[PDB]
């Protein structure tokens, strides 16, 4: 069960290295590296292992669902399968920063 | 460049700089990633007098309009004690408050 400003966080920095054109691999291990929370980076060098395995990013992310929910994955699918998955990764970075700001909002 | 554009750039440009990208790397992946032609302007702008030989405390020193006093003293500090990736990030969080709390009033 992720917090929206984790979620938020992970997804920006992660948008941010593929789009730089670093190799999945390393970006995940990036965004794993680089994060104060160690649940985070568990769950990203988790996700990595999967990728690294063999599987899609979207069935690799598709392993923790309390995370990365349905829409989410399905976004990212569609962004593997049409060779776009930078561009949905920046649509998915403005999308939860949008979750992360209703949950600060009230609380 | 508005307080949102300023805090998304700092997280993007903190994110890379960790990840070891050399800094004209990191200023040139995300003048390419901004959607503000402003934005990437100014990013390229500051690449500019980096790749000058300037500190990136005396490049974005150039944009009082962007890159507030406090911002590149913090860069100029970082850039001194070999952690500019440190000093991102936290000017990235600071960065965040500051636009989430135009968020707040925005609506």
Do not use: W
Not at 11 to 19: D, E, I, P
Not at 20 to 28: G, N, R, T, V
Not at 37 to 42: D, G, I, V
């Amino acid at each position: 069960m992720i917090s929206a400003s984790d979620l938020a966080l992970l997804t920006r920095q992660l948008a941010t290295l593929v789009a730089a054109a670093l190799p999945l691999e390393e970006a995940l291990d990036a965004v794993a590296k680089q994060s104060e929370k160690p649940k985070l980076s568990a769950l990203m060098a988790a996700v990595r292992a999967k990728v690294v395995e063999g599987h899609s990013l979207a069935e690799a992310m598709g392993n923790f669902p309390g995370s990365f929910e349905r829409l989410y994955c399905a976004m990212v699918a569609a962004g593997e399968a049409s060779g776009h998955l930078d561009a949905v990764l920046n649509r998915l970075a403005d999308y939860t920063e949008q979750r992360q700001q209703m949950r600060s909002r009230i609380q």
